[PDB]
Amino acid sequence: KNPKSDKFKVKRFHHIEFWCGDATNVARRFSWGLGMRFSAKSDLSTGNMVHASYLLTSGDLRFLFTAPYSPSLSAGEIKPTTTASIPSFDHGSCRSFFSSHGLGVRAVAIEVEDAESAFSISVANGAIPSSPPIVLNEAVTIAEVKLYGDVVLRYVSYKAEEFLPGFERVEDASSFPLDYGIRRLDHAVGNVPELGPALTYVAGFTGFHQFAEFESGLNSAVLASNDEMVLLPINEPVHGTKRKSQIQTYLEHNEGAGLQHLALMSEDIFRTLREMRKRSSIGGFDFMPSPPPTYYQNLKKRVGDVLSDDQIKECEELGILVDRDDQGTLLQIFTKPLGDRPTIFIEIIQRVGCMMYQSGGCGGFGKGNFSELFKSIEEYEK
Amino acid sequence: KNPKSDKFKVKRFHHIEFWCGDATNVARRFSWGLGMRFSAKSDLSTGNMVHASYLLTSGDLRFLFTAPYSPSLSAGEIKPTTTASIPSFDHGSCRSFFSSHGLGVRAVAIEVEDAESAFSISVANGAIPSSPPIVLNEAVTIAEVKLYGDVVLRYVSYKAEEFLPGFERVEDASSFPLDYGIRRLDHAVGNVPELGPALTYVAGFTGFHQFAEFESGLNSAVLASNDEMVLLPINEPVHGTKRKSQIQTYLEHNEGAGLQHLALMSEDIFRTLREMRKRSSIGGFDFMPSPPPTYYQNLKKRVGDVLSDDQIKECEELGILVDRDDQGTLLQIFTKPLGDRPTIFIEIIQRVGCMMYQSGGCGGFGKGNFSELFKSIEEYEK
Ligand SMILES: CCOC(=O)c1nc2ccc(C(=O)c3c[nH]n(C)c3=O)c(C)c2c(=O)n1-c1ccccc1
Ligand SMILES: CCOC(=O)c1nc2ccc(C(=O)c3c[nH]n(C)c3=O)c(C)c2c(=O)n1-c1ccccc1
Ligand SMILES: [Co+2]
Ligand SMILES: [Co+2]
């Protein structure tokens, strides 16, 4: 059931912004590790005396990395005279965020029809304002409201139809055309202490509806836009369990609520994982430990009608997990944490089924893999 | 003239420590960009609840990357019960350093005979204490005094003859054996507002002597240990010049004095630069713009007795600079800044001559390349 109750017109995920201490080193690491191209910049070389911001792209996926310069470079400026290309940026906020949480996502940005309208309607419906709508070069409007923790939901709307005004396209020489097959952001997941109030708040100001699914440490629910292409799952810990909840570990090391993982859709998850795994120990990303061979033996019964034996063997080579709901099949895998703290990580996913284009959330989010992994673990021990 | 006046026994450069906001991402970037192996760690997985520290090595070169965890993880600890492996570490100091300077070198570490003695003699001779001598597992002693800005000179001495107690050697799977030919730290250069008082201070507490050399924005002098293997050049700006002093730009963007560049000796600078340049646009380091072909035409007259025409052509392919004093010849090249700010960069060098082993500083530090670059630039315009 989809009541299509969005309180304003939402289009797609637009970009994800990391707040960094040094944007250069994180962006270069991510670029090599994920196969994303350097495509735009806003920094000292473009006249920005406030923050360094670097944009990586892969297909429609946009990762933005931002860090503050010394406030002294911009001490003479006021907001009317700012050289920052992202007017919501604040030195104090950024330094406080990174010292509190370490490396992580500050903004989940979605493209909307009218960012000013989205902001007003959101705040009229309970959203906590973070940055009011601001029109950039009469061309783009940006506004921000609180999502959870110190993460903001950023609205962006374009007059037209180049990232943001004041950003410059990156020279071909510095722009190497890496591509490991990642194409878009599928969903972005938050961890909170209490799921109920988080859901009530966000669904309250967006109109996003609960996306239907079908003890492992969590309870979760997924909020979705009208066409279910913007997908925002939220987790809370389950306490008292045998193994300590990974959601609770997140909350402790992150100093509270925040974004837990980003799921990146690949047009060819086997190629993506071959390319990422080649680079794990030479600057890229590590992956969680692979499931036992029992897991892959059990894949024949569960998805033998969707994947060939070879395709299943290819999953085993790369440590890919498989889940299935009543509509489609999901291939997925999780990286180890992206930085020092056991907080944010990345998921790579590919979905098969639900053709009309492919409908959002086809195959679910892999909740069946909690129990299937436990099963296959015990089976393998025997 | 070398009066050999060291006030305590100094051996060699031991390691360089960067203070980071996220040690993981900087270490992985540097590892890929410079061809250094991950060789030791101290972090949550080793019981360190205070800081994440990762060690890269290439030959005898040791780069350490450290960032703080949330203070909450160690809120119950006191210095007697600390889980930090580097007892001089302080959350507040580290966060203040990185917010003030951005990514940069906190510690220039030299190995000495007796770090406690070196500390006492240094402080008796004017050194400003930063961290008193502390004995780690009855095996290693570490102490720190102020060098310039917020950079410390770190003394380390070993009972024996494994980096530091509490660090664990990195598993082979996570340790990929990268090597682009870098072998040791040749020298470490600081920028200060006033050269005179900086020299008087450091030479005062070390006994390091001035190393002899032979308007470009700077004045400089080099301090050296007894065998001239520890080399610490220091720069001050020269004001009023046509082009603004790069030393003054450093001081402004760094919020004052600090380490300007690290010079890394390569056993084969042509291989090092081929390997580094291959990776510049895929996560590694960029290099300063190459000198004009006139520079390389003029190399025949200056070093045609040291490098063949092919070897000179190989320099031109890679943008290498060449200088020569009365004792030897120097090959060198400079990276663009390592992070967001136009502050710290790296120099790659190889020295030819002064065989006895090779004596320290053979060929100088390339001061002749300021004027030779200006000449070759004007010549090329014609
Ligand atoms: C312990 C063995 O490993 C699991 O069993 C395991 N299976 C998973 C299945 C699906 C998803 C997911 O992406 C979503 C689930 N719900 N929604 C909305 C999602 O987006 C995730 C995040 C996991 C996961 O993290 N782990 C997991 C790994 C290491 C430690 C602790 C836990
Ligand atoms: C402008 C054209 O480029 C130069 O002319 C140029 N030549 C150099 C020669 C030697 C050394 C060096 O490594 C030491 C010099 N003295 N000591 C003790 C050293 O270790 C350095 C650091 C440079 C250097 O930075 N630039 C330079 C580059 C870009 C902007 C502004 C300046
Ligand atoms: Co997911
Ligand atoms: Co130098």
From Swiss-Prot, chains A, B:
<dbReference type="InterPro" id="IPR029068">
    <property type="entry name" value="Glyas_Bleomycin-R_OHBP_Dase"/>
</dbReference>
<protein>
    <recommendedName>
        <fullName>4-hydroxyphenylpyruvate dioxygenase</fullName>
        <ecNumber>1.13.11.27</ecNumber>
    </recommendedName>
</protein>
<dbReference type="GO" id="GO:0005737">
    <property type="term" value="C:cytoplasm"/>
</dbReference>
<dbReference type="InterPro" id="IPR037523">
    <property type="entry name" value="VOC"/>
</dbReference>
<dbReference type="InterPro" id="IPR041736">
    <property type="entry name" value="4OHPhenylPyrv_dOase_N"/>
</dbReference>
<feature type="binding site">
    <location>
        <position position="347"/>
    </location>
    <ligand>
        <name>Fe cation</name>
    </ligand>
</feature>
<keyword id="KW-0677">Repeat</keyword>
<keyword id="KW-0585">Phenylalanine catabolism</keyword>
<keyword id="KW-0963">Cytoplasm</keyword>
<dbReference type="GO" id="GO:0003868">
    <property type="term" value="F:4-hydroxyphenylpyruvate dioxygenase activity"/>
</dbReference>
<comment type="pathway">
    <text>Cofactor biosynthesis; prenylquinone biosynthesis.</text>
</comment>
<keyword id="KW-0223">Dioxygenase</keyword>
<dbReference type="GO" id="GO:0005506">
    <property type="term" value="F:iron ion binding"/>
</dbReference>
<feature type="domain" description="VOC 1">
    <location>
        <begin position="12"/>
        <end position="158"/>
    </location>
</feature>
<dbReference type="InterPro" id="IPR041735">
    <property type="entry name" value="4OHPhenylPyrv_dOase_C"/>
</dbReference>
<comment type="similarity">
    <text>Belongs to the 4HPPD family.</text>
</comment>
<comment type="pathway">
    <text>Amino-acid degradation; L-phenylalanine degradation; acetoacetate and fumarate from L-phenylalanine: step 3/6.</text>
</comment>
<feature type="domain" description="VOC 2">
    <location>
        <begin position="184"/>
        <end position="336"/>
    </location>
</feature>
<dbReference type="GO" id="GO:0006559">
    <property type="term" value="P:L-phenylalanine catabolic process"/>
</dbReference>
<dbReference type="GO" id="GO:0042802">
    <property type="term" value="F:identical protein binding"/>
</dbReference>
<dbReference type="Pfam" id="PF00903">
    <property type="entry name" value="Glyoxalase"/>
</dbReference>
<dbReference type="InterPro" id="IPR005956">
    <property type="entry name" value="4OHPhenylPyrv_dOase"/>
</dbReference>
<dbReference type="InterPro" id="IPR004360">
    <property type="entry name" value="Glyas_Fos-R_dOase_dom"/>
</dbReference>
<keyword id="KW-0828">Tyrosine catabolism</keyword>
<keyword id="KW-0479">Metal-binding</keyword>
<keyword id="KW-0408">Iron</keyword>
<feature type="binding site">
    <location>
        <position position="187"/>
    </location>
    <ligand>
        <name>Fe cation</name>
    </ligand>
</feature>
<comment type="function">
    <text>Catalyzes the conversion of 4-hydroxyphenylpyruvic acid to homogentisic acid, one of the steps in tyrosine catabolism.</text>
</comment>
<keyword id="KW-0560">Oxidoreductase</keyword>
<comment type="subunit">
    <text>Homodimer.</text>
</comment>
<feature type="binding site">
    <location>
        <position position="261"/>
    </location>
    <ligand>
        <name>Fe cation</name>
    </ligand>
</feature>
<dbReference type="GO" id="GO:0006572">
    <property type="term" value="P:tyrosine catabolic process"/>
</dbReference>
